[PDB]
Amino acid sequence: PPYRVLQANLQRKKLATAELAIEAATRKAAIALIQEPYVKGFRGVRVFQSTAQGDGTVKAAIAVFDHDLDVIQYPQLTTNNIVVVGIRTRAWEITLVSYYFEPDKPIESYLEQIKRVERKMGPKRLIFGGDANAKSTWWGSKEDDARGDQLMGTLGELGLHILNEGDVPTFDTRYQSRVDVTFCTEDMLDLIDGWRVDEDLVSSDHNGMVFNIRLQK
């Protein structure tokens, strides 16, 4: 009965999104928190995207593979960097968010978007996943850079808790790093487990991640 979630930065690779589809089928995943999707493989899959750019570029999206899962969109909260979507079942109602922060753009405006989502969406049932392009030992990075610090500060103000674990690089090229973060409201801990990094849930310099949403009660 666990709702499995996939988190991955596809880097606009046509192949990576094919791999993502294959992994979701295999793992029987219900959700995918995506960043940098390309522009096919997703048939009866509902996809919710962040505001598209002139050339059609979408930086974040949320794929729902579970055909019967109740979904609710929040156009007011979705931007060019984040997409917010609620999922509902008898057991609960969870607001999900997939985000992507450019490595060469001020993180400040993105932190405000996180705040806006948190306040205008209640202090409970929140799960965020994406590429923050920010380093912090709190999520296994080699060190705490200034971006990681700003993000951590924001997390602290919102009561958001890091789900990351281990030191497996979420980005490998050599050059390895952990810039992808997953965090949630306090109440979500106890409903989430199995957070791990698929050594290669894909093939686009970024490593996919996986975790479950249960009930335990």
Residue type, 131: D
Identity of the residue, 13 or 135, whose beta carbon is nearer to Cl ion in the bound complex: 135
Identity of the residue, 84 or 163, whose beta carbon is nearer to Cl ion in the bound complex: 163
Could you give the count of Cα atoms lying within 13 Å of 49 in the half-sphere of its Cβ? 12
Give me the residue label for tokens 């996919």. 208
Instruction: Phi first, then psi: give them for residue 166, nearest 5 degrees.
Output: 80, -165
Residue 127 tokens, joined: 């799960």
Neighbours of 116 (CB within 10 A): 15
Residue 164: CB partners within 8 Å, gap ≥ 6? 138, 139, 140, 178, 180, 181, 182, 195
Q: Does 144 bind Cl ion (CB under 5 A)?
A: no
CB of 172 to Cl ion, least distance (A): 11
Find out whether 179 and 137 touch, Cβ atoms under 8 Å. Answer: no
Identity of the residue, 38 or 138, whose beta carbon is nearer to Cl ion in the bound complex: 138
Q: Please work out the total of residues on this chain that contact Cl ion, with binding judged by CB under 5 A.
A: 5
CB of 137 to Cl ion, least distance (A): 9
Residue 211 tokens, joined: 């975790």
Residue type, 122: G
Binding to Cl ion (CB under 5 A): which residues in 123-142?
135, 141-142
Identity of the residue, 65 or 139, whose beta carbon is nearer to Cl ion in the bound complex: 139
Q: Does 145 bind Cl ion (CB under 5 A)?
A: no
Identity of the residue, 133 or 141, whose beta carbon is nearer to Cl ion in the bound complex: 141
In the chain, what is the straight-line distance between the N-terminal and C-terminal CA atoms, in Å? Answer: 13
CB of 2 to Cl ion, least distance (A): 29
CB of 153 to Cl ion, least distance (A): 19
Identity of the residue, 177 or 203, whose beta carbon is nearer to Cl ion in the bound complex: 177
Q: Does 177 bind Cl ion (CB under 5 A)?
A: yes
- Pattern of binders to Cl ion over 72-111, x per CB under 5 A? ----------------------------------------
Helix or strand run (H / E) with residue 73: strand 70-73
Name the site residues for Cl ion (rule: CB under 5 A): 135, 141-142, 177-178
